[PDB]
Ligand SMILES: C[N+]1(C)[C@@H]2C[C@@H](OC(=O)C(O)(c3cccs3)c3cccs3)C[C@H]1[C@@H]1O[C@@H]12
Ligand SMILES: CCCCCCCC/C=C/CCCCCCCC(=O)OC[C@H](O)CO
Ligand SMILES: CCCCCCCC/C=C\CCCCCCCC(=O)OC[C@H](O)CO
């Protein structure tokens with residue numbers, strides 16, 4: 363009949379339902395796989411993965427409920443579920459998403475403190491503190507968003523949202539929406555950006571050195587100064603330089619340890635041992651280093667340093683950053699357009715049609731779908747665990 367759906371409507375809605383349904387299923391299955399991977403693998407049960415587990419929970423909630431409800435809204439052309447379900451859905455959406463953002467913040471700060479304070483922070487990095495931070499993120503998200511979405515109509519004394527529509531009445535004013543965007547999206551993005559910059563600039567060739575010196579001996583600033591000073595002394599010394607240049611990272615760090623303990627002049631006295639180190643003859647160098655007063659005065663430390671010279675490993679004493687960077691990149695890329703629309707809406711509401719708004723809003727969801735793929739691509743343990751889970 364003439365009341366039936368026209369061809370364009372049918373094709374459009376079937377396409378939308380197919381694509382969005384597929385993304386929903388992929389999101390749900392993916393995040394379930396991530397959570398299960400964290401649950402079953404003992405090697406994947408670290409604080410970072412507690413955080414990642416939380417994020418996976420958020421992404422699961424988004425993929426299961428948010429996507430489908432929003433697609434109901436899109437396909438129907440209006441809201442057919444009522445004002446109550448509208449409120450519940452909006453609250454769920456914004457609380458869970460905010461919790462995701464704060465989760466990313468916690469992760470970023472955690473990595474930052476891990477690479478910048480490798481002596482004091484890892485000791486205070488318990489699972490209790492992790493759970494405290496996660497709970498804090500979710501609770502704060504709820505306290506910050508749920509009242510604004512649910513109780514604002516009560517404060518005003520009137521719900522201005524039509525029963526056939528669904529939007530946050532609190533965010534009616536473009537200015538308020540933008541300020542909210544600043545507090546919720548822009549500032550965390552900036553902070554995480556700075557943190558990522560400092561993390562990427564932070565060498566992990568020196569992080570092991572601090573632990574080494576910690577073993578052989580808030581005082582991290584002292585180490586930060588003294589290590590640099592030692593390296594400077596090595597580069598200043600005409601005899602220590604060629605040995606330092608012709609040495610691997612671990613063993614050159616051992617040389618740095620020697621300079622740290624005795625000074626550039628004291629280490630420069632080990633002519634035979636240094637020249638032996640140049641030819642990478644670790645055994646001979648060890649035997650010649652056993653003849654020194656240094657080996658007798660501090661026997662244990664000398665044993666550790668010499669053994670370190672022998673094996674070239676930390677036996678006498680990384681992909682996560684990449685994964686997290688991938689997650690952050692997905693977040694930024696997927697959420698940026700909508701918030702840019704929020705920015706434009708402050709002076710020009712007509713420049714952004716409802717279709718573009720809808721595309722952006724939905725685009726923010728895709729992040730939850732991307733994250734498990736980031737786990738499976740930037741990490742091999744998660745991938746192997748996935749493969750082990752699909753057949754078990
Ligand atoms: C698709 N979402 C579900 C909704 C719209 C987008 O929202 C965002 O990008 C915003 O920066 C804001 C948009 C408008 C005012 S503040 C955030 C909102 C909440 C936490 S961060 C992303 C998510 C988020 O839950 C909202
Ligand atoms: C509108 C109202 C919205 C309400 C929304 C409610 C969301 C509830 C989700 C809680 C998950 C919290 C994250 C928990 C992450 C840690 C869990 C854990 O303990 O993982 C250990 C893992 O096995 C390693 O050993
Ligand atoms: C990560 C951090 C995310 C933080 C997220 C915060 C969300 C908002 C919560 C409290 C602000 C409440 C401010 C209320 C001030 C008045 C608002 C107003 O007047 O709104 C009018 C409305 O637009 C038409 O009636």
Ligand SMILES: CCCCCCCC/C=C\CCCCCCCC(=O)O
Pocket residue numbers: 423427443444445446447
């Ligand atoms: C994290 C939990 C996600 C949501 C789980 C709960 C699923 C939905 C549960 C029941 C919804 C009840 C509200 C429906 C209101 C109906 C009244 C009306 O039609 O106006």
Ligand SMILES: O=C(O)CN(CCN(CC(=O)O)CC(=O)O)CC(=O)O
Pocket residue numbers: 363364365366
């Ligand atoms: O052209 C139309 O409107 C569709 N036709 C074909 C029949 N309808 C089914 C029906 O309403 O009986 C096909 C359709 O669903 O479009 C209705 C009619 O002219 O009687």
